[PDB]
Amino acid sequence: MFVYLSKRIAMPNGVKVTSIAWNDGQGWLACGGEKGLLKVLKVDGGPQGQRSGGLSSSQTLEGHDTTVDLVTWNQQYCKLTSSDVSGRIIVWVLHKGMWFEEMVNNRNSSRVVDFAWNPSGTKIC
């Protein structure tokens, strides 16, 4: 098994990355960073997209007042979820190709340290 670097993408403002999660079904990579930076890029996983360097979409999402700490994916329904240091959790669902919020919650009790989906993508812990 071999590895080699083959690309590099710089964040705007040089914001340091704190979380990252790549979807399986379609290809929407998601990155996060401080000052509430959240980005969703689309990369084509096919060999044609690897040869042609396919990055079709790039959308900067917002709704987090501080660093995007945790990013998770659901591949059965292609549903994204992100967190915040301040203690908020936001779910994101694709409408007609772009990304919009669907639910924002703030427990105001502790700091979320993890969440994950089952193989069916039906429950988030």
Place this chain on the structure above:
Amino acid sequence: MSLFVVNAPGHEGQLKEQLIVAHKRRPLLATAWVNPPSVLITNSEGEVLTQVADPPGSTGRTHQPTALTWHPNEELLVIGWSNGEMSLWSMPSVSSLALGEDYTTAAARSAVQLIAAKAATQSSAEGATREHASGAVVASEWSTRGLYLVSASQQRHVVMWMLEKIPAETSVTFKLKPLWSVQSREPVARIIHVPSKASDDISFLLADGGTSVTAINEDQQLFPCVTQQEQIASVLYDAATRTLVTLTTTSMIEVYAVGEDIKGTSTLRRKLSRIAMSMVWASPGVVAFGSGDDR
């Protein structure tokens, strides 16, 4: 037999020599004026479309437009001022109205172009003076596909700018975001681009008017491409054949073949037997130049 009809739209300011920019495909033209500093955007035939004054947020000081560049496909202009700010002039697209094909005449197209350019917007890129370190934006250059921008200030800084074309309710807006902060030896006189395939990659060359022709790529390092024994005068590049020509102030020309890592190998070296020397591409593979003489 032919004759040149002349249109001379006067402006209250003073014209600049090298600050005239022309779109490659769309019939557009823009040029800068100083005291009062502004930019005049006109169609190809010479009729004035619009004028844009000092960048927004100016506190009573008129700023000289120091650099202009046209988007290769979009009808979008980028203006680097003298106070460190950077502005983008964008007019709403005609095709966004989705009207009929009745624009078969030049006058009707000119009228709809004028009424679209009337409602144009000048947007400010945030923190441009921070990236240029409060220095006048000397030069700018879009990529071949128009996705990447390179800006060069007078404080010996080169900044990479990312273009984001976001959709809105009625039109499509553009945001320019800084990425890097690259130090240069001198303020860059000319920024050129190299395409990966002859016809989205990072391959630019910066000529600062000295003895350095510094290449730059996605590695975020200002590695020189070709450096000659004399101070460079200008660089002339052919994208299809990847052929570089370096011309010095002492009437010396060298021809390099640019590789993938932007490295040149000399294959044609020649000598030529106040007006600064000018050199342009007469034909693919054929270069025409004059030294201010009669020939």
